[PDB]
Amino acid sequence: VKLDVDEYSEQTLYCDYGLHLILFQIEKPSVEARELLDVQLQAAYNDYGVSSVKMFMTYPGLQISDYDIMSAMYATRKNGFTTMLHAENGDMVKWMIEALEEQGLTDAYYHGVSRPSIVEGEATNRAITLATTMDTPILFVHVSSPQAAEVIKQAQTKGLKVYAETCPQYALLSDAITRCHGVGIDLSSISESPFTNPDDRFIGSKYICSPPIRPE
Amino acid sequence: PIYDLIIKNGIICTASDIYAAEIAVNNGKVQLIAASIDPSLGSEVIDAEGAFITPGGIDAHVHVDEPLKLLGDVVDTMEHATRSAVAGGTTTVVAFSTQDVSKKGPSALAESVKLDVDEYSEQTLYCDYGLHLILFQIEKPSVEARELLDVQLQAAYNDYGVSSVKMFMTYPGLQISDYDIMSAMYATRKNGFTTMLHAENGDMVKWMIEALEEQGLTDAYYHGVSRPSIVEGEATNRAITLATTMDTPILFVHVSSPQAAEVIKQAQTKGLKVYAETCPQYALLSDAITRCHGVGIDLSSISESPFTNPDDRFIGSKYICSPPIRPEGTQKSIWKGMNNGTFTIVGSDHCSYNYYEKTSTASKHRAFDPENNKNGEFRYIPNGLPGVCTRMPLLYDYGYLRGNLTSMMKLVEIQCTNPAKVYGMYPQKGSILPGVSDADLVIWYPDDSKKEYNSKPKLITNKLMEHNCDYTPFEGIEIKNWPRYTIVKGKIVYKEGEILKENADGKYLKRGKSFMCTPKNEWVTEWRPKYE
Amino acid sequence: PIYDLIIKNGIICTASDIYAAEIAVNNGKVQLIAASIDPSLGSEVIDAEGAFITPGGIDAHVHVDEPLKLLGDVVDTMEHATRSAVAGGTTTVVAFSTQDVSKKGPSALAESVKLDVDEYSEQTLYCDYGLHLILFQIEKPSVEARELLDVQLQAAYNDYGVSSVKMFMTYPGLQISDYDIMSAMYATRKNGFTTMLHAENGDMVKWMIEALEEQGLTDAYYHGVSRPSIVEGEATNRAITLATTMDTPILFVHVSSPQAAEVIKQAQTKGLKVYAETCPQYALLSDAITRCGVGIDLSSISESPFTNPDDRFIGSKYICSPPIRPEGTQKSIWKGMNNGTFTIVGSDHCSYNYYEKTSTASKHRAFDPENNKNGEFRYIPNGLPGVCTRMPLLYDYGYLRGNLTSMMKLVEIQCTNPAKVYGMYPQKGSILPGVSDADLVIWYPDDSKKEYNSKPKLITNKLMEHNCDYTPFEGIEIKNWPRYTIVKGKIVYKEGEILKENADGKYLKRGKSFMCTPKNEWVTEWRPKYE
């Protein structure tokens, strides 16, 4: 946390900022590692008032196992942290990326094809199951999947402490904007997109995010 | 005479019909169904005395001792397991071939099956057997590997008629990633294989075992605590999601979780090809039997358990299996699943380790090995129950007679016919079809009779099992019916408590592709496999 | 010869098995199944040429002309309906007996059945028929209601073997309150009857019809608009709640709504004894046919709003209740058939002429100016002819085109389950030596290059062998048809010809269904006095 605070203390800041901590390297076995991960969160909180931890279930180098998530959840619950998860199944994303590339389907549009809503639904379900077993309040970041929203809703109805975040782009944009060809933005009104600039085959990259902008 | 065997005065039960008729058998096969068959036409005549005649049971989840020792030493050979099966009215078993990771190339998986077939061809076999293939080592990356895995499945099917693959989502050394499951599913769908999954979250099981041991909670009872139903629910959900993405028919083995049954049910309602197996133990036993303290067994009537032997702190190991026997209140949901179409089939997950001998490599007490840092902790308990024998009578009694199953037709569907259909053994196996069926038949005792049958057992005992294990978890309980005759390929192999060894002529069974396992051709995205 | 009939070279299909074997028939019954039967042992031998042999279809939802004229004048008699059934491979029909509110006392309901049995005993019957009882007048208070109803049901069963009762939650004069349904359920459960419900909310239907008429929205298309799926969903939910409270096995007839299928499915998963019927029209047609993949290419249908757009009244051909649903609904009907939601499939056969306008049995009955009727949808007689096309439609669009999983599922829902749920099993519905009436259908072979002049390519009115002047499926392709329909051991239909000399159908006394014994599960501690 110090690296960021020190860097930004040198810049002109127009409003206040806080910081979440991202965790991608978790010590194993869990029990041995317990005392340090606990103590490390305590220090982060005591020194810098960081009380949230972010983790990923996808992305090479960021994706962590369910086992490691449990280890982290043990620490975060004990410390009253806000636990955040990017819930997409990394294995499915990885496998499907390779399958598409093998067929030469590598244009920006296939980013969405590589990871349909069901992938986000699965990981979210799995993450709720972890959080339940671990009795840990959990927040899902940038939710975009109906299936994810459904299991989140069911958890909330049960009274489990499951919170969620969504983003404007998931309510306002559909994946048609990532390639050539009413509760949202009229996509034809957007300037400098595949619709307006069909020749620029790379322009869909403007709207590439994770999880992807979803189908109509 | 023109027929080897005539069965008279019986009631035929199939997966869809119950009716009084008679059967003639010749050259190992069902020949004829008619109202009345002249007894002079048969060499042997059996008077069923009003009892039900069912097809022989087909148990597609049996674990036998095998050369690669995947589950360590198991007490039953194929000889022992088929003898036990026939004493309990099961006439076909399907066991498991362990992937031999020492073999490489196109023939590597055919070679894995070869080890088992060769080993068993030297044993006395009481009924036929087929083999599933177990896969735990999958080549990566996905694509690079496609050519060979596909080719390896083709070879296994072409050489040995293996058309099913079993995979694990839990157990150290067996658990494979979602990535690898997808790679396998690519190959199995292409090949029309039956894809099987043991769906428990291994990471969650692993983590929770470590947590419990840290607290010294290592008794047999905490086996269940280490892996609640939600764990099985999660993995099942995840596996359905993979199968959907991959458009691959999938079967869940030994389902025990309400949450797993729920997501399975929902998939079936959507029309996805998702099949499921459960086991008697999941309907009949609760986890109270693993430590000392109406839709199932009165646990107090079971002999030699923590209830009867409270001092023996290790005796709970008799009932340790995976997934675990569940808490009270779960069992009713298992019967519901059986009735409502959730469970396509019922197997035993037969897997035997001795309890009353402590020294051998096939003992439950294998968990005590001070020299290997093993002191009887639940983690080290060999998982499994003997159950190939008791499977059919248990569902006959506790299912049909006691009203937990809706009819005898439902019983035959899940115990006989669907197992054959889903594992490519139909129509040769599973039914009573003149000119077509192997004459694999069970004649029960009549239910409404006041006649005494000295041969008819009242209680389940270890001796009744005809197996190589020294215990059965169902020791001491009442059993209201049993096979009176088990007929395997036209011959009486079991009659009124006696095994007829001279009639043992079981053989390895080459299976076909299941008609239930052709893909739905429905996809989540526009992506299709190259070969489509 | 020791057998009347031998069927060789065929593939037997049952509700659980498909296999090559041969059948011998004698004295009206299945006598033998074997690999090969000596042709010299039979008086008649049929070479099936590799084709499927199924049990005859059992259509448990057929409407015939009856003396009390509940549905006004219907064009088909029992004679016409059984002839049509047999031409399409159905060998047992179950029609309906209208409660005669003029008959009083313990025998009141047996006497209602008597009217029909007596009327039909005088007609040529091509196959067997049973009867359901329709109830619309229930006595109050409940304690009296449920008690005479007890004795009246006993008499109906004892005299005529009627073991099913049909009730409505919609239609003026038919609709009964939940209170009355409970009274009837008390009686039917006590008597092990099969209880049937037409579950649409009548109040909502009534209100919405008046609302549409007020806006002048009276064309045939607005029949669907007046009663969307949510209306069927609601009533079905309400009826399950009643059946649960009353611990009474229940069957929903002609289910068409995804919402109704949903609550049905949920009940079934719970283990509640809730059965359901759907109909080919609900999987095959969408409501676009009433005005101007999964099922029928609607443009291929002849004489519809598409082909005759000037004829503003032609949509009436496709008006039924519940209505043919909007596009996108049809797939869920096939899913229900495959997943266990629908126990059975019937036709809800109910015929009114279209090409004659003047008779009491015409669709144009809706035009009656001196009676304040001017062709408004409300006045259109509801129903489609469907007893003939039911089996071939599922054979083709179900099995061959892959909407149903197998031939075994087809036989299960078309043949075996109808017999089981309506007390006709094992006499009917299967192929059981020494036990089954020899009611069998031999189809044409599917993968053959051989020409069969007698095999129809299109569905036409003439092919129906009925007394109606139209079929809603006129003009559409059909990829298979019964080549032989065998009824009680006799060929009644052969290669496009009805063999009237072999018509020997009879009234069918039915038993209590094993599927309709109660679950013995209750919401509260309350139990019926007799329990």
Ligand SMILES: O=C1CCNC(=O)N1
């Ligand atoms: O969460 C993330 C990482 C960076 N941005 C994005 O689109 N997804």
Ligand SMILES: O=C1CCNC(=O)N1
């Ligand atoms: O599936 C399995 C492996 C063998 N034993 C067991 O209990 N579960």
Ligand SMILES: O=C1CCNC(=O)N1
């Ligand atoms: O139930 C009925 C009566 C006849 N036809 C119809 O459409 N509904």
Ligand SMILES: [Zn+2]
């Ligand atoms: Zn993210």
Ligand SMILES: [Zn+2]
């Ligand atoms: Zn297992």
Ligand SMILES: [Zn+2]
């Ligand atoms: Zn197993």
Ligand SMILES: [Zn+2]
């Ligand atoms: Zn109706």
Ligand SMILES: [Zn+2]
């Ligand atoms: Zn009707």
